[PDB]
Amino acid sequence: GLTHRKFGGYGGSPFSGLSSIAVRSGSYLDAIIIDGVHHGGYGGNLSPTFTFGSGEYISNMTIRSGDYIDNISFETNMGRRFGPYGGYGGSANTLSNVKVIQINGSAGDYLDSLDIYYEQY
Amino acid sequence: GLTHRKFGGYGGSPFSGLSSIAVRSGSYLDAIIIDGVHHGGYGGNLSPTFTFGSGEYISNMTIRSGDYIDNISFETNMGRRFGPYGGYGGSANTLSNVKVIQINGSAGDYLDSLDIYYEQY
Ligand SMILES: OC[C@H]1O[C@H](O)[C@@H](O)[C@@H](O)[C@@H]1O
Ligand SMILES: OC[C@H]1O[C@H](O)[C@@H](O)[C@@H](O)[C@@H]1O
Ligand SMILES: OC[C@H]1O[C@H](O)[C@@H](O)[C@@H](O)[C@@H]1O
């Protein structure tokens, strides 16, 4: 199943493939914007972009979802916060004391689903 | 440890936060560009950007590395290829029959290392 491997030396400043997040939101999440790439539809309103610093990652996250994503907010290991953006429907689920590695999902006119890959601490 | 959790419904078309890849390479890799975000220096020659289709993932990847990332190639589940780009020093390692979830790492003037997160099948 899920794993990871490292290749190379020890120099450099760290980076993540997950470098920035923005959303379009109304009552739902219309779309998530990952590293500037638009995923979803064009309804709702565009949030400001949250950009991860070096060594910074999502450590806590709350997601309201039904058959779509309703609301997202998160906190990073350096105490910065994004959201809540979205509406009040759906049921809330929370990831606590994690390191988020990736956000995949599924989208149409709205953000239907999010498949969050993370380290649980 | 590593895990993942899905939120939301069952509609829409799938997407990945790992949505495009380019490299800058000479005798090794000067940089990797993930979703248009530049990780590393500006030396070497800039490969074309490989952009993943919906539902497309790296299913096979070969990396040559020493103190630095020296070469990258990969193949996707839709039968498309990327690379090899880079030189032929270092030691080769292959991720075979996988689904790549995320590419993190460390870079400076050059691409020092990659942390590849994936599912092994
Ligand atoms: O988020 C779903 C939906 O919410 C509201 O009704 C409006 O802001 C729409 O633009 C948006 O599409
Ligand atoms: O995104 C909401 C809805 O939008 C479109 O109509 C299609 O992609 C559906 O499959 C999806 O569920
Ligand atoms: O990639 C290693 C190195 O190879 C060559 O000497 C040039 O293309 C450099 O710009 C590059 O950094």
- Going by alpha carbons, the residue nearest to atom 4 of ligand 1 is A26
Record: contact A113-B5, CB cut-off 8 A: no
Out of A68, A110, A113, A114, mutate this one to test ligand 2's pocket (max ligand atoms within 8 Å of CB): namely: A110
Distance CA B28, CA B85 (A): 8
Chain A hits for B69, Cβ within 8 Å = 7-8
Distance CA B96, CA B61 (A): 7
Record: contact B15-A106, CB cut-off 8 A: yes
The binding-site residues of ligand 3, defined as CB within 6 angstroms of any ligand atom, are: B 25-28, 30, 43-44
**Beta bridge partners of residue B32, listed in sequence order:** B23, B39
Record: contact B17-A34, CB cut-off 8 A: yes
Method: X-ray
Nearest ligand to the CA of B10 is: 2
User: Do the Cβ atoms of A83 and A100 come closer than 8 Å?
Assistant: no
Q: Is B78 helix (H, G, I), strand (E, B) or coil?
A: coil
Residue B79's contacts (CB-CB under 8 Å, 6 or more residues apart) are none
Q: Is B31 helix (H, G, I), strand (E, B) or coil?
A: strand
The string of DSSP codes covering chain A is -EEEEEEE-S-SEEE-S--EEEEEESSSEEEEEETTEEEE-S-SEEPPPEEPPTT--EEEEEEEESSSEEEEEEEETTS-EEEEEE-S-SEEEEE-SEEEEEEEEEESSSEEEEEEEEEE-
Residue A64's Cβ-side half-sphere holds a number of Cα atoms within 13 Å equal to 17
Chain B hits for A5, Cβ within 8 Å = 93, 95, 115-116, 118
Q: Order the strands of the B58-65 sheet from edge to edge.
A: B81-86, B69-76, B58-65, B91-96
CA of A92 to nearest chain B CA: how many angstroms apart? 10
Out of B24, B28, B30, mutate this one to test ligand 3's pocket (max ligand atoms within 8 Å of CB): namely: B30
CA of A79 to nearest chain B CA: how many angstroms apart? 21
Chain A hits for B40, Cβ within 8 Å = 12
User: Which sequence spans correspond to the domains of chain B?
Assistant: 18-121
